[PDB]
Structures are given as C-alpha cells and as structure tokens.
From Swiss-Prot, chain A:
Purpose of the protein: Catalyzes the condensation of (S)-aspartate-beta-semialdehyde [(S)-ASA] and pyruvate to 4-hydroxy-tetrahydrodipicolinate (HTPA).
Active site: residue positions: Y136 (proton donor/acceptor), K165 (schiff-base intermediate with substrate)
Localization, UniProt: Cytoplasm
GO biological process: diaminopimelate biosynthetic process; lysine biosynthetic process via diaminopimelate
Substrates-to-products reaction catalysed: L-aspartate 4-semialdehyde + pyruvate = (2S,4S)-4-hydroxy-2,3,4,5-tetrahydrodipicolinate + H2O + H(+)
Subunit structure: Homotetramer; dimer of dimers.
Name this polypeptide is given: 4-hydroxy-tetrahydrodipicolinate synthase
Lineage, opening ranks: Bacteria, Pseudomonadati, Campylobacterota, Epsilonproteobacteria, Campylobacterales
Enzyme kind, highest EC tier: lyase
Pathway noted in the entry: Amino-acid biosynthesis; L-lysine biosynthesis via DAP pathway; (S)-tetrahydrodipicolinate from L-aspartate: step 3/4
Keyword flag Glycosyltransferase: no
Organism listed in the record: Campylobacter jejuni subsp. jejuni serotype O:2 (strain ATCC 700819 / NCTC 11168)
Keyword field contains Amino-acid biosynthesis: yes
Length: 297, 296
C-alpha cells in the first residue's frame, strides 16, 4: 500500500582529505557496500557528519550516492532533516530533485518541539515530496521524542511517511509501535539491538557497523527477514563487541577510526567540533577489530 | 577580561505574517532598556535562532545594536552553531555588526567530545576580539561542557569570560566558581536566578524578563549589591511565572504570555514550534494575573 525502503541499510561515513570531501573514496565506499549485500545507503546522515557539511557538499554526496547506485538494486535514502521546518522542506525537495529514492528526516534537535509541532513539522515535509519519508527518532541527540501516537498519526495521515528509524534503546516503544500499527516499517538505528528489533517485526536497519562489516549486517538482516531468527541472532551476538566499541566515543568518531585502521579510508579526518578519539579509545577500537573479518574493496 | 554581565534578556523574535516584525522587535528592545536591563541577547534560543534565516539573524542583531546605541545597554549576540566553521563565521559577523559580545551555545546534536568542545570554542575565541560567553544547556544540545573544559577555555582564551548555565545543576555552579572564581557565571534558568547570583554569579540571561523586565533587573541589581534579602524576595515572588514559562518548551510559553499581555500582536511561531495546548494557554493566562506587566 505504501512505497517503502527497507532491508539492510548503511549510514555512510563521509571521508575527508585535506578538509574536503574525498569524492572518489566516497564512491568507492558506496560500491563496497553495494557489493556486500546492502539494500540501501544513507548519505549525509548523522554518521555522515551532515551537521558540518556545506549545502553544496550535501548535494555532492547525495549525487555521488545516486550515481553509484544506478544500475543496481540499491536505493539512496538521503539524509534531509532539520530543526527548522522550512529548511527540512527545502532539503527534502533537493534530495528528491537529486534522484534520491526517499529521505531520512531526523526529529528537530535543540529547539524541542511539542508533539503537535513534530506532527506539523513532518506533515509539511511529507507534503513537499512524492517519495518515501522515514522518520528518525534519536532523543539522546535531539532532546525530543517522537511519541508512538505521533508516529502512527503521521503514518496514517501522510502517504509518504512509512516508518521510523529508532535509536532510543527502547524495545518497549518498538512493541508499542508495531502492536498498534503493524503496517509501518520499523527500522533499527542501534546496531547492538538489530536482532531484537527485527525479531519483533522490524523490516530493516540503518547501521553504523555496516560501514566496516557490510556483509555481516546484510546477512543478519536478511536472515531475520527470512525468519531465520537463530542465524540472525548468532550474527547479532557475534557483533555485540564491535557494535558497542563503535560508540566508545560519539558516533562517527569510532567508526571513522575503525575505517582508517582497516585501510578503507586514507585519512582520519573530521570536521570540528568532531575530532580524533583518545589514545585509549584508538587502541580499544583496534583491539576489538581484530576479532572480525573486515572485507576490503 | 572584558565582560558583559548584569540583567540580560533573551529577546523573543516576534513574527507578523511570517516575517520578522522589525518594528515590534525594536519596540520590545526599547521597553527592555526603559526597564533597567543591562544587555539584550538577540537571536538566542528564546529568539528562535534555529528557524531564522541568515538574513533574519543579521537583521535582528543589527536592530539590537542600533536600538541600544547611545544607551549603556549592550548587545550579546547569539552566534553558536554545531559546526565550528559556521560558529566562527557567525562570531566574526556579529563582531562586524557592532555586537558587544557573543553568546555561543555548545554544539547540539553531533555530541562532540570534551576535546572537540575545547577546539570548537578555541577556534571561535581566536576569530574575534570581543567577549565570548559559553552557553551550556545539555537538555537541548545532548552535550555537556564539563567544568574542567569551561575553566580551561576561560584560562587559555582571552575572549572567553564565562558561561550561561541552563543545566539545573547548582553543584556545577559551586564547582565552577570554587575552582575558577574569576569567571562570570550567568544564570540561564530564571527560577534559580537568585541561588546562582548568591553564589557569585554576575548576571542572568532571562526568559521571564521579556514579560517582567523591571522585576528581573531589580532582582539582579539587588543581588549584585549584596542585598540578598531583596533579591530573594523577588526570586520567590517570580517562581510561579518562572515555572509556567516552561510549561512547554521555551519560547512557546513566553510568546504566549507576551501575546496575552498585549506586548506582541500575534501568537506566531516558526515550525516546528507551535501554539501551546489549550490547557497550557489557560494556565499561563491564570499565572499572569498575579503580576504587574509594564506596558510600552
Ligand atoms: Mg546539583
């Protein structure tokens, strides 16, 4: 009934070289995701350091994602959120214009809208495009929570709104959502609990770990969607150590560190206020990484 | 260090037909000036900085500087960002337009580490030569500037002279001033204005003063005169309005109160902010009846 974007999805890191987006590396990383079973890529989300990219760089990375996924089954679910509704509408329209298959739209950060404000915020976004819109709830970062009732109202009232990427450590809410609106696409935004969310009827993940181990996250998700819960849980259990250490510091500081340690990106560069991890954390990530196979290019 | 302290107002930004009501904006600032306020903070959190365009940001700062010219009232311009390159640009811009200093909120959403926060604010401080007030509000940003990081920034960077705390953490307020008594601690939470001042805080950046500038200014000046009995008296009297003004997320209640008092023409916000619930509207209206609201 609704057009959806589900399955194993990757919140792409944005590699920097000499303070600019390494556009070749970016395309190479997306191709590596495609070749390891990923179903969709999320350019310029939180893991992609959307906050510190210019509007032009925002467009460059979405376009590279769109162009790299052409001729494949992999879709582009472009990050396009804002805590200003007029800007979120503009970003949604840009992402559509750029060939995105849908948008991921984070709940307004910092200004703490009410549930009524969130409803009007996302309705305005939904009314701006004709492509699928996935809500994104991460209260630890935004200071706000999209209630289950607000999500279900948006799902029922807006054709393009088809689900939510939950990063809230709240499996109760995941039960709440799918028990009252079983038609929505619940997407895990927290790698450590990928399997419990999938096993409750979630239909995908938007993963940080998949930057480093796309084949494992892909296999986990597809096992779960095929109702092979025993095989899905084993991979989820296997990934717990890496899933946790990748948040030793604020994402994407650890995942970019791991990608650099694996030789998958050429420079450990961030955009301030993000910075390199502590020495202690650098070493801890390297230690956890040694227990996993990291696919190359 | 050059400082900006005393009674300060986080100015609301009135909208009329979807645009900044610049006449209303200037008129509200004059009312603040005539009511004993020492500085105004354009386009802070209470001013809906997040939903203003870059031009609206420039325009309200210009109106503030320019309206306070020839008065002793200073302009502490909101200029923070969660991208350091942008926060540097906003700081340089604010300096260029005659602001006396800047309020720079800790990066929201992307949760920098303490090292990143230090480098973030270090870059800002070195880009201008006007005072820089840190702004810690972890409930909104998802990050905390630790006491150690604030003190390091105060000691390492000339322009950084203090912090506006909106953290409900009087322990931290003791921590800050016991280890670095030279910094200017500024209250960002109206209900506890007096406890912060009585511990050596040197000012407030107030939401309530939009509605009751004379009372907040008088409270602050009593406290700075070490008339703690009178400062506390006002703080106690203001608790009810101070509390109801956060019934919903600021500035939803304060704009509701300004509208109810006849001080602004329309209860307009920019999405994702919206009108309060019918219930909250009525609660704000009821609490207000116990306070005397200065007109224009
Ligand atoms: Mg305390």
């Amino acid at each position: 009934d609704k057009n959806i974007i589900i399955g194993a999805m990757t919140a792409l890191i944005t590699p920097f070289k000499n303070g600019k987006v390494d556009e070749q590396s970016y395309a190479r990383l997306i191709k590596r995701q495609i070749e390891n079973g990923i179903d969709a890529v999320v350019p310029v989300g939180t893991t992609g350091e959307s906050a510190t990219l210019t509007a032009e760089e925002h467009r460059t990375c979405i376009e590279i994602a769109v162009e790299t996924c052409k001729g494949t089954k992999v879709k582009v679910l472009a990050g396009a959120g804002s805590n200003a509704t007029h800007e979120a509408v503009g970003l949604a329209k840009f992402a559509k214009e750029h060939g995105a298959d849908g948008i991921l739209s984070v709940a307004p950060y910092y200004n703490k809208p009410t549930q009524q404000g969130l409803y009007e915020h996302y309705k305005a976004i939904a009314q701006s495009v004709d492509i699928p819109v996935l809500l994104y709830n991460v209260p630890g970062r935004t200071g706000c929570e999209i209630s289950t009732d607000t999500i279900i109202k948006l799902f029922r009232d807006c054709e393009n709104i088809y689900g939510v990427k939950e990063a809230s450590g709240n499996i109760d809410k995941c039960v709440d959502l799918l028990a009252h609106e079983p038609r929505m696409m619940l997407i895990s935004g927290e790698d450590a609990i990928n399997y419990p969310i999938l096993s409750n009827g979630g239909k995908g993940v938007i993963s940080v770990t998949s930057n480093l181990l796309p084949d494992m996250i892909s296999a986990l998700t597809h096992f779960a969607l095929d109702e092979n819960y025993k095989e899905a849980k084993k991979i989820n259990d296997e990934l717990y150590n890496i899933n946790k250490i990748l948040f030793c510091e604020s994402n994407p500081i650890p995942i970019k560190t791991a990608m650099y340690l694996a030789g998958l990106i050429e420079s450990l560069e961030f955009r301030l206020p993000l910075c390199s991890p502590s020495k202690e954390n650098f070493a801890k990530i390297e230690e956890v990484m040694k227990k996993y196979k990291i696919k190359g290019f």
